[PDB]
Amino acid sequence: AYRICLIEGDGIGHEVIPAARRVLEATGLPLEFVEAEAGWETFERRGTSVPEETVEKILSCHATLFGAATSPTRKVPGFFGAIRYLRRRLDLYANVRPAKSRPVPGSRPGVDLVIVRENTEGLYVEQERRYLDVAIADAVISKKASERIGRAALRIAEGRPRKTLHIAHKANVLPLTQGLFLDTVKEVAKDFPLVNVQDIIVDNCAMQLVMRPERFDVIVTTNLLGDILSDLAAGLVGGLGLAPSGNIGDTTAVFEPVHGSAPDIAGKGIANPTAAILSAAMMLDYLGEKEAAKRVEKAVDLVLERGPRTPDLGGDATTEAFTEAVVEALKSL
Amino acid sequence: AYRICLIEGDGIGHEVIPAARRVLEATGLPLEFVEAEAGWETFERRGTSVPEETVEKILSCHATLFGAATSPTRKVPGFFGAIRYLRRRLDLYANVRPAKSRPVPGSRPGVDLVIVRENTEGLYVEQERRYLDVAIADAVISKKASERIGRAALRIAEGRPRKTLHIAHKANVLPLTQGLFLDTVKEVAKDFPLVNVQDIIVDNCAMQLVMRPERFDVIVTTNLLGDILSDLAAGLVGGLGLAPSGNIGDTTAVFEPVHGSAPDIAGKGIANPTAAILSAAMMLDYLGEKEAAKRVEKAVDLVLERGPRTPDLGGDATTEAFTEAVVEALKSL
Amino acid sequence: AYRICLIEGDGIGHEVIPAARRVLEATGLPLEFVEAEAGWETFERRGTSVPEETVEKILSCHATLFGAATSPTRKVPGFFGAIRYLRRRLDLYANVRPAKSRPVPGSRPGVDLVIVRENTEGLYVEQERRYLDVAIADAVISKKASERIGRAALRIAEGRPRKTLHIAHKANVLPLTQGLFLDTVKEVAKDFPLVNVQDIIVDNCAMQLVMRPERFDVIVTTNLLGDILSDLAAGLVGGLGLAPSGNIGDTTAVFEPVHGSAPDIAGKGIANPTAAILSAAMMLDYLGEKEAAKRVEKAVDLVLERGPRTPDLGGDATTEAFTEAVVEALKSL
Amino acid sequence: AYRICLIEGDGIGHEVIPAARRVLEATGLPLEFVEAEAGWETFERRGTSVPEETVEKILSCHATLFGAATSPTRKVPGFFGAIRYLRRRLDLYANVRPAKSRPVPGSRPGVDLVIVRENTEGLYVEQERRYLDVAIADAVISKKASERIGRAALRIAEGRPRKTLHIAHKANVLPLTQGLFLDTVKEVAKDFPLVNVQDIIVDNCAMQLVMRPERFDVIVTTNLLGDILSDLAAGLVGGLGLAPSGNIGDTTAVFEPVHGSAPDIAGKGIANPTAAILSAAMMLDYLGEKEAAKRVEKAVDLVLERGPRTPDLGGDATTEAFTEAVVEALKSL
Numbered sequence A, B, C, D: 001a002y003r004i005c006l007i008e009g010d011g012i013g014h015e016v017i018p019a020a021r022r023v024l025e026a027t028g029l030p031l032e033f034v035e036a037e038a039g040w041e042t043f044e045r046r047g048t049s050v051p052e053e054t055v056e057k058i059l060s061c062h063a064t065l066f067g068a069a070t071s072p073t074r075k076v077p078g079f080f081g082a083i084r085y086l087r088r089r090l091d092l093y094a095n096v097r098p099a100k101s102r103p104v105p106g107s108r109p110g111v112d113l114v115i116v117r118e119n120t121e122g123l124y125v126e127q128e129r130r131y132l133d134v135a136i137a138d139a140v141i142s143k144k145a146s147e148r149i150g151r152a153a154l155r156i157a158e159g160r161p162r163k164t165l166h167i168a169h170k171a172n173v174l175p176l177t178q179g180l181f182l183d184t185v186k187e188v189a190k191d192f193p194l195v196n197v198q199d200i201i202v203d204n205c206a207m208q209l210v211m212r213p214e215r216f217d218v219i220v221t222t223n224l225l226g227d228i229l230s231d232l233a234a235g236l237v238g239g240l241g242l243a244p245s246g247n248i249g250d251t252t253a254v255f256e257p258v259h260g261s262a263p264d265i266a267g268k269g270i271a272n273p274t275a276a277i278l279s280a281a282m283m284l285d286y287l288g289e290k291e292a293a294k295r296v297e298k299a300v301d302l303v304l305e306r307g308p309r310t311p312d313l314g315g316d317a318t319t320e321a322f323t324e325a326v327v328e329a330l331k332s333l
Ligand SMILES: NC(=O)C1=CN([C@@H]2O[C@H](COP(=O)(O)OP(=O)(O)OC[C@H]3O[C@@H](n4cnc5c(N)ncnc54)[C@H](O)[C@@H]3O)[C@@H](O)[C@H]2O)C=CC1
Pocket: A012, A067, A068, A069, A070, A071, A072, A083, A240, A241, A242, A256, A258, A259, A260, A261, A262, A263, A264, A265, A270, A271, A272, A273, A275, A312, B172, B200, B201, B204
């Protein structure tokens, strides 16, 4: 009996997480769902964006599936970003973000890469100050975190057909912070002689992803850089409607779509639940249910190929209609 | 005569700047070219990447055309990155990077945008420190610098028919630094009632550029963010072989390709000089020779459409063969 | 009636503030006393060391007299230093700390000086971070805060007999922070030709205060530096049982002893209320009741000279006895 | 023989170092002296305050005896403070600074204490930035540097009869940096069960040193704090004419007076050489010549007690005259 923590969050979180649940239910696997709260709406009702109860429930489960949470673009007393809080507190240091071609009109063919983003430090240390009309933020790179994110990315590349790892960085401008990251990952690469390791300055990396994403296997990079490159890559293979992720540490994992709360479409009945469902597939993989994971992915691909499709894929289908198509496709496998 | 400082830098700078010089010569304008040096090779021979003499030559000229300079990915005592030193020393606070559909196979149609990149602070303040195994860099945002770059971007938007500015930022995670930037630009936008000002989180902006770049007019953002978005954008419209830029302060400007020294192709006689040539067109415009600037851009589009083409555009033309085609087309206008 | 906010705080604040109230009551002046709460005991009772109510009460009065408050030597959730919060929030930028010989055995004669301590920034911005086993704190000096503290100290020096100002600093090891302080105070000094302005390195300053404190008139210095030198100075003239201060901003002021909550003697009935009483005298001066202030100070001197004395001055009097003697001396003037 | 490196520095270093040499010569020990230069004049001649040649000489001798060097109160391109450079580069992490009563007019009796100051980090890390009119310095405290200085002070306390260590700190205002210091020294104290370990807030500590310095045995503290407290303590026992020090690392040591170059009396041949001579005595102790140290100390005390005396001690003797008397007293012992 797998205990799964389900956390909806804000906006389209309320729409795509129940969809993912319905698909998980249709695997037949023994699953016990445990509901918990985080995000802006939780801050409004409980006074904190992440109640202690929610941490307890996550830790009491085998894995968690998170939708999304909205963040203000300014200081709000008592408010801190929910998922970012969870990432640092549970030490979910590896953010694993695959980008794969799928059979939809908006997708470049031939793409199969994974972005591995350091998920605890960098600018995301969030240590900012304002003095008169000058604001300063720490960007922090530690050897320790670089070793762990590097090792994580190397394992992933070693486990993949092409065994190629690109280190994306700005060491040329930031040789102490970005340089420590670069050199540390190259150092741990010595324990992975099967992996071919390359480095790429991050702006070039972004131009290469646009022009020839097929060249990449695994990309490892730092926190903010990974945030950016992973939305870019999603754009290459059909958009945020489809892009999954895992926030993975040593003892737990929180699986979530790369996308946010999407307030421009929350309440319209049309959000694409594919990203949340494929995040659930990654979750099944992490739990040791590789077969069920593949079946979920297969089901999604069948529907993506032959319809119905949500508006972000050029269709006119509701979230409900798309989810049901995926459930029936899965039942037939 | 207009005095134009020429600086080749490293790698393909030695190839594309002479090419650009030859195209300027064919405009028929009176130009006195003042050669100066900078970069990695300059540091090896002189002990500094930017001699004082070079600075004096730049200030003695109406404008400067700069190739590109190599930087290492590690601290090298006495070495500072050349273009970055110039940017800060000469206070070239606005980095203007147009991205525009061109008639070549690698190019999306319908793209016409300008990225206005704050060119002075953010992470490029270069105040890094290392303490045992933790490294820390300052990311600095000031009201003053944000006012100036916001005004520059608003002026450019006001001058363009679609009257739209997007502010790309990450203020949801960095509300003091990125938030100050966001708010200050919004404030100064009050003097520009004709401009439609929108804000967008930088990861989402990167996805939007990949999926629907036609929706953008002008984009303003901070230093590292604009570095990344502008190589992204170069990929949309044929690549770094074509992308021009201007580093523009209140009293001077240094025009240069977005691209670097490209050591993988340096010396092979095949680099695309279009980026340098179009940067010279931006320079001609800055100086008040708008007609000549249009004639240069037209010559370039003629050659891009009908060939010959360099290998980055799928042809087999040399840098000089391409340049000769542009000079010939220029003279026929 | 003058409204006077009374805040006891922790430890011996409970003992010396009621004593100072009694001496104020014996001046004959029209005084309405308004009680408010701050400190550690307030944090335990109310969940914050400075309730908003306390801030309002302070602002609704002509002046405030504060005892002292205990601070932990570690992070305690929800707790912040009370007096430091009030200094920053109410912008009480000048901490005026006089050191004057008194007729008691513990005291050097011929001493009459004022330490003017910047009360807002330096190390006291309290912006600390911990990354693995490395901890960093900001030490901030701004031109503006240095201008205000410089002017405050030059005005005070201008109005005293010797018209001499010493700027105590460590510009020698910290040229950007301490140097800015040093240079800025020297620059505002140009508007005060009446004052002889000298500078002195702070360690040397500490040695000179030990060996010839009689040489000093006014000393101006930064937050932490002035904290240290002011305790040193108190020790020269009878100790902390005698040393008064004012936290003075542009629109209000909080008077308080230099001393803290003295937990080693809280509840022993023997704490010297002279410091609190002299602070009340300073308060009277700020309010424009100079003759009342001189009477209070005279009554204090009479009792110090004749006895009875508290144990910190070698005597055996209770706080109560000492207080009654000052009340009696005051009424006989 | 012992190889002893001698560096004069600037100002009165040119007077007190030759004096100390003279007294060393008169001990009758095999000593080769090796001259070397550093400081501000040295910066003016050779372009650096510390030539590599000087570091090399230091590292080639058994110990170094340093004079004092001048430093400005503003940035000077190319200049770094000499002793501070040597402290960091040679990792001379413990600055041992004894304060003992001597038989002279300006001396409190019954003082015998040692200040052990962390000599490597804190505010001396030399990482300042200036952004518009705001300057910021790093104040850094590491667990490692704290363990190290802690253990040095604990060993010294264990070796003394009163077995008491005070930790002077400001962890009430800076709980992360100063707190880390406090807590770490307490941790390492568990290996020294014989030592009584107390903590004291540095301002209170300064007042206690003024009023009852006889209560202190060993005092450990951070870099800037120790600087101030050690000049304070020199005042107690006759002044900077007498106060000696050692900068002790694991593999080398630089002994030097607490005092600076003393530009107010440099050139007049009146500087008190006792501090330098007592620093040479500390150096003899360090080299294993414990008995010669005790003789040098006894010689100094005889001359301080019986005369002649320099002006700082209320006499009229020259540096040479005083020196010759010390040599004559040493020779008769
Ligand atoms: N893990 C989390 O808690 C995350 C939270 N956010 C937050 O979400 C809020 C809004 O962020 P945005 O910049 O507007 O980015 P977003 O990722 O929420 O949406 C960006 C664009 O993509 C479209 N989109 C996203 N998911 C879609 C879907 N499933 N189906 C169809 N269209 C989809 C949206 O309609 C929107 O136009 C912000 O507060 C942001 O911080 C963003 C990402 C992750």
